[model samples]
Target: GQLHLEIAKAPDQAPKIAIVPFNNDNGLYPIVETDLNRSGRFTSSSKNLPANAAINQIQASDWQAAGIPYVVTGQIKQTADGFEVHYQLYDVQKQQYLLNELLNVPASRIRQAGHMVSDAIYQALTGIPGDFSGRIAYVLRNPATPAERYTLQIADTDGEQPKTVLSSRDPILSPAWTPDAKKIAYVSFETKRPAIYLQDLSTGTREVITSFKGLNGAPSFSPDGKSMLFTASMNGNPEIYQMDLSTRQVKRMTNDSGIDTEARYTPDGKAFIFTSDRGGSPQIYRYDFGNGSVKRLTFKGSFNARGTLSADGKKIALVHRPSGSNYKVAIQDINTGIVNILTPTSLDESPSFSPNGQMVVYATREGNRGLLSIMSTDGRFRMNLPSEQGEVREPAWAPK
Candidate 1:
């Protein structure tokens, strides 16, 4: 379902990958081309030739003159399963085909197939594994007259043709994809009160995971996807609780005096990071499951919450409010412990890292309406998720 191509003089060198026109069997050509370039591994050419164009028609000489080393050409043919993609790689200097492969993928996986092709092309030339073949999920909301309608959606990493997985007339918040990428757990207020629900992405089926009496929200899946950690309050103040998927058993993990919410597991699954209002204001805190201890991790911001770890577990992207009207997305080095503000928005929340840890998606307010936006983790190439007359929130990067 996926293919790789690499064009390099040698295996150890970084190869410049140029993507030519691939047959847009599904009429999704522009999305595929843009996604491949955004993967951050290839230096693709600006011009795209026709799918059946010959090598010379691609103006290979011009690309070579421009310092592009490798070139990719492909075609997507309709197949019984779905689509069969046949592609080839060329070494610009030698003017030879480096590799050729055919991939047959299901129609439901058209977008993923594109990413798989990019990964193959990336690995063949660059000698490194690619991370573009993952999925991403986000919440879309429309604040209408009576109430807002929330729709949970999933799409390929490049944000193409998102498929709506769930929709509710009530509010929905904080979507977390399972590690296996087969299911998603999120908080929903469809019952007029916040509760957690685990929905199977494969079947479009759901089960109430947490319907605690008081507050039940912010459900995050474990790295293994076998358990979920959420914030629930049966008594007075919200606290963290863990729900084992296999047993449907809920365990209390925090017994603090203040309101604790937004629990996110680290990549290692040994600890969790959440927000708490214990120190007179909201801040991020880390709870070590191994040591059974809690420690405050952020003190500079007047309010900081919704910490989402990078895919590699090397960085943390969070919502930081330095002043009353100064909420922005910030990232912190997990090892170096240096925090860098990455966004200049007046209000931003629920920042989630991409599968490759290069970008993030967060929610913000635009003229009294909520909108979804994406930017590089370093605060570059910021863009809004395309939608009309709706609010988007709680974007979660799906598993690889």
Candidate 2:
């Protein structure tokens, strides 16, 4: 049986919401409505209500009659220098206001303003931090042609305004975000061999962090950002290692003959979980920093790899293959040892958790093309984000 967390409420019935149109010509209220509905926690009304309705102008009885528990209305107008937005949320049953806020931002950041409003509304209602304003980094590849091009891109969670962080004729793999969300570490093959490079998103500058003789890949930052846990083959076999950022001092963490890779730190920063094949088949394992011991964490499946822990350290998301050639994204409870499969696709990998741990994003294929998909941790909600041009993979959800 699946063990459910106290916070993981079953969404048998979604909350009903109504978002009145905004006064601005940018059509922002629709964006907020779409975002809230896609979260799978709310069902929005299709009414095309007028914008900028005064609080007194609202008919609480009308919305209550429609069975909508909440209503959101807002106004956006051009300011002398930029734009100003004001929004309010109300409880229809009590006919009382819930929240109101005013925001000012440059016109270029209008979409960001919409996301902010959506975030506010979502958090106010659900009590969970919203991930709509966060970003996602993914690798895009065009392998159809003889000369292939791979690009590492970053965009909003909704797949808008993608900015290429790095582009090369060679392949790019395993993009990981720093805790601060300012830097990204990825393994690039631009040098004809796998090397890990760290890139600053603001300055568009990059530095090779590790170009070891053999494999240098799977870079993930520690909780404090003082060190990085990665996989290297420099010691004659693929093993997990940690490197201090200031001193560049490297320390080996695992000493097994089998391959140990994709190391990720637990939320408490005292331990890390990684994938290993030492048990004759690939499985997940946890390494403790206090005792310097290792323990196996998975046994239900023939294959389980690329594990990423949740923020609470109680669950892990990874690729799990139960009994077939196909792989799916599965979540495992640390205490109960129960695995909940989350996707229906045959080939899913690179599962990443939103900072809030409410959702998981991963890379999967549709027919012959790759795309990014998101699902709630309970496996209740799911959505796919496909690219327009080529295949996308190795998605890393940025922190807030």
Candidate 3:
């Protein structure tokens, strides 16, 4: 017989968190646990408790004896204002309360509150702000049925209460979130051809920003969100083009005759990197706006596509395959060109770097089931998102 258990060694400078039973008005306990584990700073485990267990029942002695350095307890109360969530982080090792806050939020924001709770605990413990409060936009499709039917879904970073912001039976691709996470520009097939459409998240409204005669797809928003880089076939082949939203003017960014797609902006917004087939095979390339020159970024893989820059703008993550039987979620340093394969699973696509630039989310087929998964920037702590229902694809990490 084989037994498996996960153990954590106290980081030379990390904290351990013990989460007490809280009121999950919707029974979304898994989301809370997942968010805590994904923070990459804290190690977490569950204690046996009844489903109706309340946070007030937590005894300090019971937590201290468990050897957990910190305890997190919270209560979700139904109030006239909407919902009131009160959470506290206690330093069990020091025998004192470290931080506490009461959040008054709407019922629709309970899952979001869970992430916020994780953020508070994370920041209070590690002194670094958590990114669990951000959002991730991804494309969903039923490849077994038809490519035309698809959905562009956005959810909290923990993948809870995901609502479809846009649904089309005509294949939606590359949902790129703006730096503010308030809007997404994606390629939608409304004109019987692929075209890029920018939609406002607040109003649930959309406007066709690039409906050029040729293919217009893979729209990447500038960090400022005032301009976008997208692939258009207006020049007789797919090439990268930049469009200013304010002036409605377009500028040709790439002159290669081969296909150029999946443009992503760097964190500073001064330069961008994209996938191109100009070198006779698909590889990553970078364009510096300051110098108006294009430089090659990747040279190892047989093909690389859908390249995304990290938040720190030091590394690039892309779908890489060195041989026939292996496709990987791979990353390479921007300066050293050192490559590291992040996942064992092949057929992984659309890797998006997290806001902290320390993780990546991508889509893969789990035994013919389309699913999404995430991993740390260093290729550790991999976990699948809680998307046990339908197929998921094209994850775009929301910019801060």
Candidate 4:
């Protein structure tokens, strides 16, 4: 399936910056522009701007007339190992340069180089690391083709260069990336029953993680990639289980009678948060590894499922149903235990935070049409993904 995402936009605020074409047309400028716009932190323009080799070539008058306060330009020259990507960010109004650096990247990774440039400029500006270099894995389902009903795809963070990882007639669900981002653990029904499979992205190989008789779903990888946490009902009702990757020993993490699912680890690996209806209605509960004690984390929302935390483990983003049936993406502050709805409308699902934790990408509906929304956790800027081949669902951001 062909999937595409447009640029991120926002109010007429923030510094207006222009991403001029690099000295060489290495096809990196567009990716850089899209990354910055997607952050919703900057108002940027890349059109009708003069390309430059360095900050010295900046024509301040051109930017001043266009009301652009900042500019970014760079050049990528070929190297033996890869390419030498030199980029520069300048404050046009102050007539001062902000960033100048050279990045070395391996061959055939011009797209990676582009995101690196975006990360540099973004961190230099916002004091927060950029998450643009990470890839996004999503499920694309085209109903017209029965033989190939579902396709798992991985693309750049901006939805560029989408690669179909696997396709099958049976259903496929939840693509969870390993800590190293070298493999993905997901659920597929090729056996006419739900099973968890871990497929190496590099070799395009697969390993059946679990095919228990009852149900197997929502596979989440450990931060160290040495273990996996998933939900299974082999013993009857669904329960959370963690398995040692090396020893292959399975241990049930939660033993509640009510349905327990969607377990995800914290960045520090000290705890995990998952959805539970054990408290009567669905809510998020945190389990600490040290004390072997479970604590309720969220109280504001009536329905909170598919709970996931940010990079620093200070915030939790989830599919939230507050008071009504409308589902929207919401984030909860771990310290204050407050939840705030981030999506503009309902029908939002599967919110995964960017690797840097500054933004979130999730699935939402507009007029019953399936679309993707990448919004800053602060609810500042939102970039929507539009598909040409089919509907896109279940976005999983790669680990940086």
lDDT of 2 by residue, 1-400 (tens): 0100012223467887788776654767777877777675775654754333453357787776666788887777788778887888888787877778888968678668778888888888888888888888988888664255788888887887778888888989889999899999999998887888899988888887777776658889988999998888775678888989988898788845566567999878999998888778888989998999999998887988889988778889999887765787899999999998887655546699988888898877666656777888887777677766577788899976
Query: TM-score for every candidate vs. truth?
Result: 0.82, 0.92, 0.84, 0.90
The per-residue C-alpha lDDT of model 1 at residue 78 equals 84
**C-alpha lDDT of all candidate models, in order:** 0.71, 0.79, 0.73, 0.80
Regions of model 2 farther than 4 Å from truth = 1-13, 46-56, 145-148, 255-260
Better of 1 and 4 by lDDT: 4
How far off is residue 13 in model 4, in Å?
Answer: 1.2
Candidate 1, 1-400: lDDT as tens digits: 0101222112122345667667565643444565555644444553653233333344457657757777777777787878887877777788767668788888777666777777776666656556667767877777572344777787765556577776788878778888877888888888877778888877789988867577658888888767888887788888888888898898788746575577889999989898888887788889998999999887776988878888789888988888765777888887887888987554446688876677677777657656556666655455555455666677787766
**Clashes by residue pair, model 4:** none
Best-matching candidate per TM-score: 2
Q: Evaluate model 4: give its TM-score.
A: 0.90
In lDDT terms, how accurate is model 2?
0.79
Per-residue lDDT of model 3, residues 1-400, tens digit only: 0011122222234456666666654443455665777676666655663222234444566665656677767777787766887777788667777777888877676677777777777778767677888878887775544643677888766675576877777888888887788888888875586778878889989888877577657878888878888887765678788889898799788846566576788889888988888878888888899999998889886888778888888888888887775778888998798998877554546688887776688877666556677777765466566344457778898877
lDDT of residue 198 for candidate 1: 81
Query: Candidate 4's residue-wise lDDT over 1-400, tens digit each?
Result: 2666765457447776788777665677887886777667886667776544354577787778767778887877888987787788998778888898888878888888888888888898888888787789998887888888888889988787888888999899889989889988788997787888889888888988877676558888888878888888776678888888987788887846566577899989898888888888888888888998998888886888888878788888898887865777888899897888887545435589887787888876656567777887787777878677567788899877
Global lDDT for candidate 3? Answer: 0.73
